[PDB]
Amino acid sequence: AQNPNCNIMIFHPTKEEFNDFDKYIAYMESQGAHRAGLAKIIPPKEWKARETYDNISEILIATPLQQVASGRAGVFTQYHKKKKAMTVGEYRHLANSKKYQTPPHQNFEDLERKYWKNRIYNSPIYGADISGSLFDENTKQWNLGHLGTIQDLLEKECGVVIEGVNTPYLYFGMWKTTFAWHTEDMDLYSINYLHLGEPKTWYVVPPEHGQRLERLARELFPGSSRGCGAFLRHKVALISPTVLKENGIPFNRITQEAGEFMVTFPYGYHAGFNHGFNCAEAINFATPRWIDYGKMASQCSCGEARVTFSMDAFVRILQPERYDLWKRGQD
Numbered sequence: 001a002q003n004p005n006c007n008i009m010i011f012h013p014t015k016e017e018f019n020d021f022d023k024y025i026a027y028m029e030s031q032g033a034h035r036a037g038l039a040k041i042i043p044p045k046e047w048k049a050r051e052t053y054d055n056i057s058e059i060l061i062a063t064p065l066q067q068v069a070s071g072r073a074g075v076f077t078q079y080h081k082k083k084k085a086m087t088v089g090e091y092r093h094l095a096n097s098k099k100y101q102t103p104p105h106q107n108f109e110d111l112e113r114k115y116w117k118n119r120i121y122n123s124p125i126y127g128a129d130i131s132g133s134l135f136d137e138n139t140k141q142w143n144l145g146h147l148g149t150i151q152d153l154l155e156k157e158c159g160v161v162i163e164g165v166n167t168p169y170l171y172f173g174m175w176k177t178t179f180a181w182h183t184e185d186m187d188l189y190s191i192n193y194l195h196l197g198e199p200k201t202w203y204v205v206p207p208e209h210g211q212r213l214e215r216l217a218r219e220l221f222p223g224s225s226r227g228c229g230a231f232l233r234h235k236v237a238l239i240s241p242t243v244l245k246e247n248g249i250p251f252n253r254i255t256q257e258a259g260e261f262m263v264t265f266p267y268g269y270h271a272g273f274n275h276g277f278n279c280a281e282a283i284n285f286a287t288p289r290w291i292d293y294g295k296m297a298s299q300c301s302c303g304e305a306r307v308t309f310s311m312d313a314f315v316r317i318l319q320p321e322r323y324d325l326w327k328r329g330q331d
């Protein structure tokens with residue numbers, strides 16, 4: 001088997017290899033990339049997402065979220081406090097303010113250390129889950145707004161027609177803005193392009209050891225666990241790499257920089273943080289290989305996780321037994 005230590009692999013497609021998205025995902029998985037739970041894709045030097053980002057200040061962040069932490073440095077939950085709307089311009093200015101800017105540091109490793117030591121003592125504001133794309137419509141390759149849809153994948157593989165659409169989301173980040181330990185909705189893939197700004201650091205557990213993570217999480221957040229058997233779906237728990245080492249949880253880390261794609265694979269748990277003001281775009285996608293992961297995906301039936309319109313149909317078709325109890329959580 002390829003990639004038996006489950007390392008994060010980095011790919012450098014040629015522009016010829018960058019034409020067929022589905023094919024290159026399949027290629028990466030033939031080299032074992034999926035075993036890590038995450039891969040890096042460096043686009044070919046010829047490729048451009050768009051001409052410039054000169055005009056993006058006028059994008060509105062309707063609901064910025066202040067990420068308030070509770071707990072110890074390496075084991076904490078965060079809750080999202082809703083703030084007043086602001087433009088990307090206002091957000092970027094806020095991200096560069098003395099209160100919120102990235103501190104002095106030698107390298108990513110020094111900054112990682114400061115993040116984990118000082119994360120809980122601060123409340124950065126995130127512009128997350130904003131519907132839209134910054135890909136130019138004339139960008140034909142790896143345009144996240146022009147991928148085949150999950151519904152069409154489901155229909156090609158299983159013969160069933162369902163409602164739903166699937167569109168990209170933008171994420172405006174600043175120093176310390178954090179994404180908690182999670183898999184994608186329905187354990188789908190995700191693809192994330194870092195359009196501009198400072199880096200994003202990612203941690204990931206191999207899908208074949210996801211249950212080990214889940215078990216640690218139940219021990220670390222014992223109340224949350226009683227409340228909901230898929231409480232990582234709530235996207236609030238943080239666990240540091242030190243804590244993961246101490247408890248024997250296999251994992252890897254990598255930093256994504258501007259102009260790079262990351263792909264998460266079905267049931268690859270991930271978490272991470274932003275180094276400073278940036279903007280990423282992301283979307284879930286599926287392959288034939290996803291269908292069984294979707295069949296087996298854990299669901300939140302405590303009602304905290306509150307998920308998209310399009311997820312109804314996935315659960316309804318792939319998880320008909322779960323569908324009576326799950327939709328009562330969604331309503």
Ligand SMILES: O=C(O)CNC(=O)C(=O)O
Pocket residue numbers: 171178179190191192264270280282283
């Ligand atoms: O970019 C973020 O903050 C979170 N991104 C992801 O979890 C993803 O693309 O799967």
Ligand SMILES: [Mg+2]
Pocket residue numbers: 055056057058059
């Ligand atoms: Mg604008």
Ligand code: NI
Pocket residue numbers: 182183184190264270
């Ligand atoms: Ni994700």
Ligand SMILES: [Zn+2]
Pocket residue numbers: 227228229230231233234300301302303304305
């Ligand atoms: Zn729940």
